[model samples]
Every structure is written in structure tokens, then in C-alpha cells.
Target: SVHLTLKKIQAPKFSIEHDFSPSDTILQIKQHLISEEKASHISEIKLLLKGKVLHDNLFLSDLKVTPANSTITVMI
Candidate 1:
């Protein structure tokens, strides 16, 4: 399970925990956030996990990211 804490300047900064395997792509994360936050457009959103920028095609497991990963910034 991955515990993702998302922090945005405009929206409420909250934590979203999910049971996602490493096989999941960055697009999966985007989809997760969009559904959780009820976002209409993903183009305006930016994700920063553990102080590093994540590409849409990469998998979370390949990135070697963990449940205790650092702050996630969702830029609008």
C-alpha cells in the first residue's frame, strides 16, 4: 500500500492512501488524484513526490518510491 500525502496551494492538503503496486504508471496516480479531488482537467496539475518531479509514463515502483515518501505538491 502507498500512502500519498498531496499538498496543493489552493485545494486542501490531505493524504490519500492506496494499495497500488509498482506496476502502476504515473498516469495511474494522475487518475487517482483526479478521482479523489474531482478534478476536471489534469493538464493544469503537477505532481512532486519526495521533492522529485514524476513523469507520466514512469511507474511508482520503478521510481523506488515508498509509503513514507516526502511531500507531494499538486500545482494548479
Candidate 2:
């Protein structure tokens, strides 16, 4: 399981993690956020990895994440 933890930029302790697979994309995470009611739509969701914006079509397996336990910043 990939420890792709995401926390809202405007808040904390209200994070979510689904142990994303490397095959997963940022779009999936955005969709998950909406499915969980944390977001309204994928268009409004932005994922930040290491302070850089993560694109929707980019897959985890292809990302340059340093560790299995990676933290992502969420902005919606």
C-alpha cells in the first residue's frame, strides 16, 4: 500500500488516505475526495507533491516520490 497521505491546505486533522497504488492517478484522488464529500468536484481539487503541483493524469508509479510514505497537500 502506498502511503499517499493528503491534508487540506486550509486545515488539518481532516486528512484522508486510501493507500493509493502506484497505478493510481491524481484524478483518482480528486475523485475520491469528492466521493468522500471533502470536495465538490475534481476541477476544484489540486494536489501538491513536494510543493509542486501534481497533474491529474500523472500516475503514482511514475512519480518521483522519495519514499513509500509520501505526504501530499490538498487545495480545493
Candidate 3:
């Protein structure tokens, strides 16, 4: 099991370079981001990769994305 930890899942205020693996899922990303950001639920998060909005349950591998840098937007 890979215990990948992302330091920040917010916006420009944070300077984290950490990224997700292509094999990961949107659900996984949501879980971690929500946890790190201390949000109560996944509905508080929205994800975009390469300027495209991702479906909440999408698998990263299915998207075939090697997202170099991504903008992870969150709302509460």
C-alpha cells in the first residue's frame, strides 16, 4: 500500500509540488485532499486536470493523464 501524503490541497497560497499518480482515482484524491484540508466531506472538493473538469468518480488511469501540474479547487 502506498501511503502518499499531500501537504496541501488548496490554492496558490500553498506551494506544494506533490502530485497524484496516474493509477490513482478521483475518489482517492478526494479522500486525501479532504483529510489534509480537514474538510468533512468529498462534496467540498472539485478537481481539474489539464484544464478539464473531472468526473467525481473517475479513475485517473481511465483518463490517461500524466497531470504535470493540476489545479485542485475546493469549496465549503
Candidate 4:
């Protein structure tokens, strides 16, 4: 499993916490974002880490986000 923090592109204080399997796809995270952030859809959300956009088909572990305190910035 993996745990991470998520925040809007320019709003770090408005953040959310998440826990899931490292094998989960970016699309799954996007789905969760829709519920947690009231976002339009998976397509409307962009998950970025260390300046790289997380691809939909990739697993969280594939991006080296396996630790408990990693951060993902969500952009509209």
C-alpha cells in the first residue's frame, strides 16, 4: 500500500490524504479525486509529482510514490 498527500495546483493548504495500493493506476486516483475534490472527471485532473505528469496507465509505485509522505499536485 501507499499513502500520499494531494493538493490543488496553486492551493496547498486545501489538501487531501489518500491510501491505496501501489499497483493502482492513475485513473483510479483520478476517480478518487473526483469524489474528494468534486472535480469534473478524470480527464480534468492532472496528477503531477516532481515536475512530471503522472500517466493514467502507470502505477503509483512506478513513479516512486511508495512511501508514506509523498506529495502529488493536482491541477485542473
Candidate 5:
């Protein structure tokens, strides 16, 4: 299992915490954000980590993030 902190750019109050599998794709995280009311639209947002923008086809493990405490920036 993997845990991540989703922090909205320039919006510290809109952060979210979620668990996911290492094989999960960025698209899955976008869906979760909308379903969880963290974001209104996935199309208008971008996920970033270590200053790199994430793509839908990339797995969570591809980001080289820690297992339980990585931070992913949500740019909208």
C-alpha cells in the first residue's frame, strides 16, 4: 500500500490524504479527487511530484515516492 498527501497549489487548506497501490495510475488519482470532492474537474488539473508533472499512464511507483508519506502537488 502507498499513502500520499495531495496538496492543491496555492491552496493549503485543500489538501487530501489517500492510499493507493503502487501500480495505480495518475488517472486513478484524478478520479479519486473528483469522487472525494477534493477537486471539481480532473481535466483542469495536473499532478506533480519532485517538480515533474505526472502523466495518466505512469504508475505511482514510477514517481519514486516513499511508500507511506509522499506529497503530490495538485495544480489547477
Candidate 6:
């Protein structure tokens, strides 16, 4: 389990962190973010680590996000 602190790029910066189970899929978060009004569509969103782009279907654990807290960059 982990808490993902999702930060949308901005001049002032922002966060929309949420608690997630290791089994949860990337597709799951996209929907949640949409509900939170983070985006209008899943297709328009993407995620980033230090390198590579993260996509849907893969579980969050596959991304190796560990510890009590972890941050993910949001790319539009």
C-alpha cells in the first residue's frame, strides 16, 4: 500500500494526493482524478517518474512507488 502525492505542474504547484492499495491499477487513478476534476479525460493524461511514461492497466506497485509517501508527476 502507498499514498501517491500527485502534483499537477503549475507556477505555484499543487497536490491531489490519495491513498492507494498496491493492487490498484493506473486506470483506477485516472477515473478518480477525473472525479476530482483533475482532468476531463483519461486519454488526455499521463504520468511520469524520473524517466518513462506510465500508462493505464498496470498496478501502482509495478511503478515501484514505496515508503509511506511517494510523488508522481502529472503530464497533460
Model 6: pairs clashing at backbone N, Cα or C within 3 Å: none
lDDT of 4 at 44: 88
Ranking by TM-score: 5, 4, 2, 6, 1, 3
What TM-score do all the candidates reach, one by one? 0.69, 0.82, 0.55, 0.83, 0.83, 0.81
**Native-vs-model 1 lDDT?**
0.67
Pick the lDDT winner: 5
Off by over 4 Å in 4: 9-13, 66-69
Candidate 5: Cα lDDT at 34: 83
Clash count of each predicted structure? 0, 0, 0, 0, 0, 0
Predict model 6's lDDT versus the native.
Answer: 0.76
Task: TM-score for candidate 4, please give it.
Answer: 0.83
Clashing pairs for model 4 are: none
* All candidates: CA RMSD (Å): 2.5, 2.2, 4.7, 2.3, 2.1, 2.2
Relative to the true structure, candidate 1 has a C-alpha RMSD (angstroms) of 2.5
Residue pairs of candidate 5 with colliding backbone atoms: none
Score residue 39 of candidate 2 by CA lDDT.
73
User: For model 2, what is the C-alpha lDDT against the true structure?
Assistant: 0.79
| lDDT assessment of candidate 4 | 0.80
C-alpha positional error of residue 54 in candidate 6 after TM-score superposition, expressed in Å: 0.7
Error of 4 at 17 (Å): 0.3
Report residue 11 deviation for candidate 2 (angstroms). Answer: 4.2
Model 3 stretches astray by more than 4 angstroms: 1-12, 15-23, 66-76
Quote the positional error of residue 3 for candidate 5 in Å.
0.7
